[PDB]
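Input for the complex:
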Amino acid sequence: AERGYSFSLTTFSPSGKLVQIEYALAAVAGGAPSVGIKAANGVVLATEKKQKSILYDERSVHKVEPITKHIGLVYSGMGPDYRVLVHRARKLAQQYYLVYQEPIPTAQLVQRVASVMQEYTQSGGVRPFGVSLLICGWNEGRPYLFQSDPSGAYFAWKATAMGKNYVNGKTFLEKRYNEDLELEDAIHTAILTLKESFEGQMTEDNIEVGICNEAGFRRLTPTEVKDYLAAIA
Amino acid sequence: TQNPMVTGTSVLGVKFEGGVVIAADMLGSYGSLARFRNISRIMRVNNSTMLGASGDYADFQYLKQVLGQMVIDEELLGDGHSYSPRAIHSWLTRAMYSRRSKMNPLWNTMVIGGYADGESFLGYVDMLGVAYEAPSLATGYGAYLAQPLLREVLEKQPVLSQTEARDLVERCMRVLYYRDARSYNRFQTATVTEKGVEIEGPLSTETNWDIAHMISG
Amino acid sequence: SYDRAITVFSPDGHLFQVEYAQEAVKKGSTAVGVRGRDIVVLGVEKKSVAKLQDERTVRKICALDDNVCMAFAGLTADARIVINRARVECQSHRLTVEDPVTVEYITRYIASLKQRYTQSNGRRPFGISALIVGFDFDGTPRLYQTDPSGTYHAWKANAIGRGAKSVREFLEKNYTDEAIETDDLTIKLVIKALLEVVQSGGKNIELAVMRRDQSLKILNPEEIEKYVAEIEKEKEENEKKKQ
Amino acid sequence: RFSPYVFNGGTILAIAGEDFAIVASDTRLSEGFSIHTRDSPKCYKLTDKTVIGCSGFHGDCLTLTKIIEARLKMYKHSNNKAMTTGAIAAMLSTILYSRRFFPYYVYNIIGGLDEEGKGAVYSFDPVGSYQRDSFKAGGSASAMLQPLLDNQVGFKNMQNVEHVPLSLDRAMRLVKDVFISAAERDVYTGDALRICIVTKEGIREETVSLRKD
Amino acid sequence: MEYLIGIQGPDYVLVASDRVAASNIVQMKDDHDKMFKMSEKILLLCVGEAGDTVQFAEYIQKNVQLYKMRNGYELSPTAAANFTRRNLADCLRSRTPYHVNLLLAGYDEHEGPALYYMDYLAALAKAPFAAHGYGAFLTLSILDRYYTPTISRERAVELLRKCLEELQKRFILNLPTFSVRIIDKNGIHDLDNISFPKQ
Amino acid sequence: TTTLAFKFRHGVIVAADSRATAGAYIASQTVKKVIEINPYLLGTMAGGAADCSFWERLLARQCRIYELRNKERISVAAASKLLANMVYQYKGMGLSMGTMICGWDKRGPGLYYVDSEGNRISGATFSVGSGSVYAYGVMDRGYSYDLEVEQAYDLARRAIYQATYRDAYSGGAVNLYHVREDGWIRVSSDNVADLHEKYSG
Amino acid sequence: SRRYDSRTTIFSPEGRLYQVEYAMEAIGHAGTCLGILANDGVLLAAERRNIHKLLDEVFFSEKIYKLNEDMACSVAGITSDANVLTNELRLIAQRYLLQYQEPIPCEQLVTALCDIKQAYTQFGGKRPFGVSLLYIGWDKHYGFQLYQSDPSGNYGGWKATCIGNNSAAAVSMLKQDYKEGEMTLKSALALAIKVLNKTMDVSKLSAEKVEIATLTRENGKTVIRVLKQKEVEQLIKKHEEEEAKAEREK
Amino acid sequence: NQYDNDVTVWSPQGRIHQIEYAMEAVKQGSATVGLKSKTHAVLVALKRAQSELAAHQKKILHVDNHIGISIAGLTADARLLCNFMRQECLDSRFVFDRPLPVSRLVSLIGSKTQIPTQRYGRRPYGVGLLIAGYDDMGPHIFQTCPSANYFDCRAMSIGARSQSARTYLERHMSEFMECNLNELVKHGLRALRETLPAEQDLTTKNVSIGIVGKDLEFTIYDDDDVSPFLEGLEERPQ
Amino acid sequence: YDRGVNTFSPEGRLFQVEYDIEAIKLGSTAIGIQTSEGVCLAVEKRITSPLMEPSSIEKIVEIDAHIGCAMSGLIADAKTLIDKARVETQNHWFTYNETMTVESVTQAVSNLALQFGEEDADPGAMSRPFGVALLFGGVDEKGPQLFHMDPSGTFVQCDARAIGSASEGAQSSLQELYHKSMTLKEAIKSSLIILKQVMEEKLNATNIELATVQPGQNFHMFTKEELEEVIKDI
Ligand SMILES: [Mg+2]
Ligand SMILES: [Mg+2]
Ligand SMILES: [Mg+2]
Ligand SMILES: [Mg+2]
Ligand SMILES: [Mg+2]
Ligand SMILES: [Mg+2]
Ligand SMILES: [Mg+2]
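Predicted:
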């Protein structure tokens, strides 16, 4: 027989900080890196899927997940927490569509999921999600790229990174690329910004990438991946 | 139950010196259809009490289920305590009344037969919760065809023997067969005595149709 | 739902959460009240006239019904809640019964609310004391006070909040049949009491009163400087002309 | 469809004298045009000075009876004393009212002694409306028994008569008469007539015989 | 059977109701009042079923008053009508629907005089003049006939006088007296009852 | 049943027959239809016996609590208003109640009529019951707020009697109560048989 | 269970709620934000914190929220916490509009949201929201009004005020340079860039390091707008390109 | 003390202090004794008075015609348990029209009082009980403790200095079964006296007796009613 | 040290209940005496200021015409118990149409005894005991009676009893003066004599409450004058 803790597990310290949230971010800063680029003509998501411990079947699980026909995700942090948020985003995505008959506007999906993440920083008996997400979408012509973290706060980026060396991965992009970048272009400068930390032999199974153009969102196959890898394609 | 489906007709019960006897045909009718011709409408509730049910057989099976668990439960304690005939009859009255009060009755009229402390127990229970004790009981059509005979006998000899009684039951089970259109000349007889509860296999009665040949005359 | 017991007894028989609530009341803007015979008065001290403020949106004085009103001292937010709960009870006492709300009845109601909140799981007590004013329609004019403990009493005059102890010591030495034997002088003793601890300026006060039948009246800073002069100089016709 | 009620007949009568109360009822329990049993009196002892009779739907009389019994036990544990005839009556009223919207089809009559030692009788309708009376009858023979009592026990419609108190002896025969006359016209009344007499000495029972038809 | 009438002028609103409380074949009360005070510039004329009228009326009443105590200022007659409409319409499909028909007469020191009519179904409409009850059938045509958007309160009390006389003539229900009241920039003012010399 | 109450200069008069029927059968003629709520409040019984007794008894309970909590007797309006409220919840469920709540407030004589239909009104005079229409007749022709105490007694007592005459469901004895500022007094209680050998005897 | 509960809604020996005070702390570190009241309008100016050369920012603002049709507000504190209190603010507005069919009186929309925060401090065992808000709007009762709210469930109407970083240096400044009764939306926007230039560790207070919004009447319908990049700088230069002209007087 | 405040916390020794502490509540209560012949169950108890102007505490309570009890420990908990016990009995009569078998009632107290000892925030019942009853299995004397445990006894006593009484009872057990009532009661009164300070003994003011048996429904005796039993005492070992 | 409100001490006593018994010792003192001719209750209001209406302080209240009750301790708490009592007496009268004995009433109130707790509890549930001691004085079928009840939920009858800060002393005096045969007249005198002693302030007719209930007269709260009359014999 189970009861439940009704007091919040996140509380302001005298410094005015919300300790658990910071610590959550620490779990993020310690996770596999992720990069997102808004190519003013689409968006790209890519992360370090370095599992493949020779026994791990890289296939069976993904980190770049489709929310709707036109939305997509990637994270940096605790994998299990992510999965929860993926099921909730996909769900939130449907509750919108049933009511409005129009696919959910990317900004709107972000707001909704962010609200959830915020919920877990005040509700009783729980800890904040140890994860940060990068949502990408094509809603009404313009491409979108967002990031929401443990606190439940979100921002729209032209491009960014999270996880290990996200500090360096950002500065790198802070110059190593800019707007007007076309499709395949933003994809290259993305897999590159990844290698700017990717320790090891970055192959087609060490990474996973998805793109979101104004014609749907999808994950690229090991093929199209092995290609871009050869420093081109 | 709001609409009885498969049902059993009348049930009889009379007490004698050192025991009680109950009779009930083995018919499960579905309207005017003698559908299930071989089902027992009698039950043994522990060693000193037995029960016979008229009405919706499904509900009866239900009561049989709950009462069986109750007896089992009690036996597990082996604390030297066990439901008496009056107790079972009391519980049944509470149960039948409770359900009647929820407007969802168990469609049965029942005869509780028991023996405990050298005394004979015989009790009646409605689906509405009307309950009482008496030397003879007859439900369904039996209340119009059997009870007048049973009383007749008892108003002239209050004390019968297991044999005198079984003789009366057979006579009644015959009258019932002759006049109740939903009876079956294939019944059971349950008896309770210091020895316990005994149920007797498929029985029948000699029937006399010689009046059939008196059309013209 | 949160069931923790917030207010509990201590070794010597104390209810700290209540005593703490009472402390928050202490750190509040003083508030005094005097019971006359034709007009009861109330004034809220340390009104911290930040000027960049806005008088209306913060007057520690409120009306509950058309025959009752109150002043408080303590946690601002709490007061609001309690104020609007008594307001509701006021109208509901008219739907259940037909007659209006009494002087005491409503006060008792507020005390009962506070007391309850010192004995219910999940809740903290209300950090405010209240000076309830009103005339007992078809009777005398009464004055009552309440503290977080949930206890309540009728006062001839009283003060709660910052230095209320002082103003109380004072009030106890100025109340007499004679002292304020007329509405003009009644509203005076309060004016004096408040000032007898109230920061210099007069722009720190916010008095007001209710008539034994008329609506409520929140005095204007004008009628303020006037009654604040009728004594500012009266505090010289015996202190600067006999001293 | 399904009715949760049945009419079992049977009448109940009670009279209160200076120092005694009588409660009588036939003993027949029927249904339809049949007789369930000839031995089913409607009188039951609640305390040493309080008796109740219930008629109507036997299912309800049984349940009601068991509820009253339990509640007296509760009262005893709670106040350390037995319930006075008057309190039992007050209680029965509320018990009947709790089923105001699904009534106990029951007509109860309480017969006993008040705290002052005198006789008392309380009559109730199925939903608890009640009062105290000198005498009252409820049930099928109800309208058969009453009239004779209004005349004999109330000296009504009689000019220049002697308003002598109801001697327990005269009462006991009035009871037997009205029930014997009723047994003649009400198909529900018959078989036997049990009487319960309540006095300072206790409760005494007497069973007179009636037509078995 | 209860009658309600209201005529809106350019600067005021005149309203009236009968004073009979009927039951079976008898008038049980000679001086019954169908009007309820909500604000200083608002009245709620309510008629209908035995308990629903008072219960509902007072409920909307005390809730308007509560609004006064909570914000300091009163609700505009226009805002009250939408309030009362909200509740009545919200109870319509509840377990406790209120079977009442009403008129809401009020004056706004900014919008002017206003008269609202309402269905027990909670349909809300603004109108220059309106009535409820069987009387309405025998008198609404009169108003259509003699009402002018500028009728002065002297005229209005006369137009009302006409409708009231009509009921003494055609209507089969007794209805001897009628409470009358006016509302202008200076609040709710009573008026003498319009009565008829019947024993 | 026939009940009535009117208030004049000397308070409030309340009278009633005492007959209770079950169809056509007279089940009793010793019914106390003037319910002694409190020594300061009176109620009547019309419609359902149990319904009136129970709720008003409940009202008595509520009034007593009120008094203990406010060291003041509850006002007639307040009391009648409690009863109205208690009962309104069940509107539509079959409660049958026709009663008049009478007393003396801080407003003077008080009389309210309350229904299980939801009605609740203050008035000078009221008649309730199957025989009410008859009582109204004689009472209306004879009622004056200025009646003298012994005059008011005769009127009320007469009205109820006349009703017991025409209405088959009204009869027995005629009960009469007088509500004075201090408390109520049980004026008289006379059989109809007697009252007849007087109004014409 | 009793062991892990921090008791976020209890009194301290002092008689204060420590979790409220700590929320404040968080507030006095957030992007500065203030509003001033004129006679033809009312405004809000906040320290745009999401300042960075990579963000794509696609919103009308970053800290300016449209509540009512006659109202808007700004926040200082935890943004997520803020998105929650505003959403609820919009709902309270509409519920009023539905029920009364008229825009909700400004102060009332505030007392509403305040009763909720007040609650989070009296019961529930939950932490209060780490937010303080500035409310500006117009209503047929007090026309233009500016309001401020604390996570304590406390509020007040201000002719002028500030929240956030150095929300002390900002006050006193306005507390003396404010035209109490003689303010124009122009003389208002004046102190705006003046005070923000001060309390804001920024030299030559760029157009991005700020967000401006103004509410005004205009032939019936209320108008709410956030100044465009250019429109901002006009007041940027105007401030300085008048300041050097202020030292030629000393 | 990390293992002393919650009944849901086991100590490193496989004990639950809260339970033990509650047991302490029993020991504090004044002593009471229980014993049965083969036809009677008897409860005997010593009542205490706060001051001399106050009455002595109830220690024996009537549960049902065939059951009564004596208490030791928190009074409020005794009333809770007593009422549960009373209710359970009323139900038995209602449904089965027969008295609730004493042993079955005891099993219910056992189950009921066990629950709170296993849930966070709950506390053990703080009362012991001696139960005297008579069912179709004869007389019975049961004991129930703050720990949901219960015992079927030949004789027993709980409370302050009840160790003496136990000792006295253990010595004359063999005698009990064949005692006639008055003798059985004496053994009880005698055992109780064992728990007192030598310079004082049984008064008609501090003794209470409860008797139930094949021939009598549970009955309580408290003041003058206790005399008949106190007469014919015993020297009282000096 | 933080534990549940329902924790036992090694001594087998609930901390909270013990800690409130303590709170009573901080209340004003009240005395109740029981005579064959009636019962009386007296308590020191313990006024803390001239500006406070001595009348707006009732430590003695009516439960019902035949029952009065005096309190001490956290008076705010007693409000609740007092109401439950009045309500109880009426439920009994409603149901049984007869008055409730003084013992049953006291008992009814005592069942709210240890009705406090956290987990596994309703929302409108007490979180701590009531820091109150009570004295129920009244007359019923068993004659005049006085009962005492503290927070443990325990209650008993007393010929005379005292509660409050001066309780220990007061009770000593009561033991010296009580007579199984004294009178309601003698009783009231003793009460005031003793109350006068223990009070820190000089016994005024405006700083004490006295009330009686006798086999004939229904509960009576002594007037300002009737006090003068008895105080006259200091
Ligand atoms: Mg990752
Ligand atoms: Mg059916
Ligand atoms: Mg301000
Ligand atoms: Mg004071
Ligand atoms: Mg029988
Ligand atoms: Mg609307
Ligand atoms: Mg509604």
